[PDB]
């Protein structure tokens, strides 16, 4: 049974630090910059063990080379919420690993969101995006305005769940609405002992203030081991899957691209260089079957360490697929003159 577990003072709490978090991130990022932000203070309310907050009315303003400013983007409303909540009161610096062991002694994972509502560009963005691709074709001039211009809900998401003595996070990010759906979801693996390792350096979450703290004496104490915790951080899987109801816009694109397809799959040398294409066309039909154009994407990293990236190599990777199709080997082809290219 689900209810009040918050009391309102708690909520009141993190509601302060949250708005004074933010306002100061505000008035950081701002000051001399000629980034300025609108913000209003959150609203903070209990629902079970999260609790939810929303901001209004919010937008973000860079500066004009003349001087006046101009809208990056906007947000009807912004929504926060946790259950990352630490409801005792004790007042007495905790470790960071008791701090966690408390969170998931009473909830199965901790999660959190924010999401923007009524996410919406600014005029001059859709401009530079408009003078960006200019293909004097009228419809995609005004299919592209059209979408740019449209307001759409951005949402990120994360999630940590305890499995054995490892913890399972889940990091998503979503760009949604009626005519486009983005999404993207990255799922890493972390060591319970990158937690001990944490707490080696003193680190104590302070149930007053809430922020994880640190021994002053620690600074005159510190070359850099940031590359430690790359032991403790695996990789398992990054996903892209979109749609676009594109009203029949591109047809003619992917017509014209298919045939290059063609044209450079007998312009390959050697047979390696022709599955690449084969494949290339292999997924393009697949996502442009329709005006509703989809895009299914899927990276799996063997499990090992991010630390061993530069050692294993390419072969820190596993296995693609793109619409139902398998792109392993064809990546592991292209991905190293890539990387072989562009690194010259």
Do not use: H, W
């Given at each position: 049974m689900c209810g009040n577990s918050i009391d309102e003072k708690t909520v009141k709490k993190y509601e302060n630090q949250l708005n004074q978090?933010?306002?100061?991130?505000?008035?950081?990022?701002?000051?001399?910059?000629?980034?300025?932000?609108?913000?209003?203070?959150?609203?903070?309310?209990?629902?079970?063990?999260?609790?939810?907050?929303l901001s209004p009315n919010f937008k973000t303003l860079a500066k004009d080379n003349n001087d006046?400013?101009?809208?990056?983007?906007?947000?009807?409303?912004?929504?926060?919420?946790?259950?990352?909540?630490?409801?005792?009161?004790?007042?007495?610096?905790?470790?960071?690993?008791?701090?966690?062991?408390?969170?998931?002694?009473?909830?199965?994972?901790?999660?959190?969101?924010?999401?923007?509502?009524?996410?919406?560009?600014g005029e001059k963005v859709v401009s530079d995006i408009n003078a960006s691709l200019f293909q004097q074709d009228p419809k995609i001039s005004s299919?592209?305005?059209?979408?740019?211009?449209?307001?759409?809900?951005?949402?990120?998401?994360?999630?940590?769940?305890?499995?054995?003595?490892?913890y399972l996070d889940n990091l998503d990010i979503k760009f949604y609405n009626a005519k486009l759906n983005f999404n993207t979801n990255l799922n890493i693996n972390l060591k319970e002992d990158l937690l001990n390792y944490l707490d080696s350096k003193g680190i104590k979450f302070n149930t007053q203030?809430?922020?994880?703290?640190?021994?002053?004496?620690?600074?005159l104490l510190n070359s850099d081991f940031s590359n430690t915790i790359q032991k403790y951080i695996i990789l398992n899987n990054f996903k892209i899957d979109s749609t676009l109801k594109t009203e029949?816009?591109?047809?003619?694109?992917?017509?014209?691209?298919?045939?290059?397809?063609?044209?450079?799959?007998?312009?390959?040398?050697?047979?390696?260089?022709?599955?690449?294409?084969?494949?290339?066309?292999?997924?393009?039909?697949?996502?442009?079957?329709?005006?509703?154009?989809?895009?299914?994407?899927?990276?799996?990293?063997?499990?090992?360490?991010?630390?061993?990236?530069?050692?294993?190599?390419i072969d820190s990777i596993e296995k693609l697929s793109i619409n139902n199709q398998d792109a392993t080997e064809a990546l592991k082809i292209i991905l190293p003159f890539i990387m072989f290219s562009m690194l010259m």
């Open positions: 978090t933010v306002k100061q991130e505000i008035a950081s990022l701002s000051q001399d910059s000629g980034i300025k932000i609108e913000f209003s203070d959150f609203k903070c309310n209990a629902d079970g063990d999260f609790i939810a907050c006046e400013y101009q809208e990056l983007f906007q947000a009807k409303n912004i929504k926060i919420r946790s259950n990352e909540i630490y409801k005792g009161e004790t007042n007495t610096s905790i470790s960071i690993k008791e701090y966690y062991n408390d969170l998931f002694k009473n909830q199965k994972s901790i999660q959190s969101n924010l999401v923007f509502e009524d996410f919406k560009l299919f592209i305005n059209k979408l740019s211009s449209d307001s759409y809900t951005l949402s990120f998401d994360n999630s940590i769940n305890k499995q054995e003595n490892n203030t809430l922020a994880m703290d640190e021994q002053a004496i620690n600074e029949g816009v591109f047809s003619s694109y992917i017509a014209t691209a298919k045939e290059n397809l063609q044209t450079l799959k007998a312009q390959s040398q050697n047979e390696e260089q022709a599955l690449i294409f084969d494949k290339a066309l292999a997924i393009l039909n697949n996502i442009t079957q329709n005006d509703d154009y989809k895009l299914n994407l899927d990276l799996k990293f063997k499990n090992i360490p991010v630390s061993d990236y530069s050692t294993q190599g």
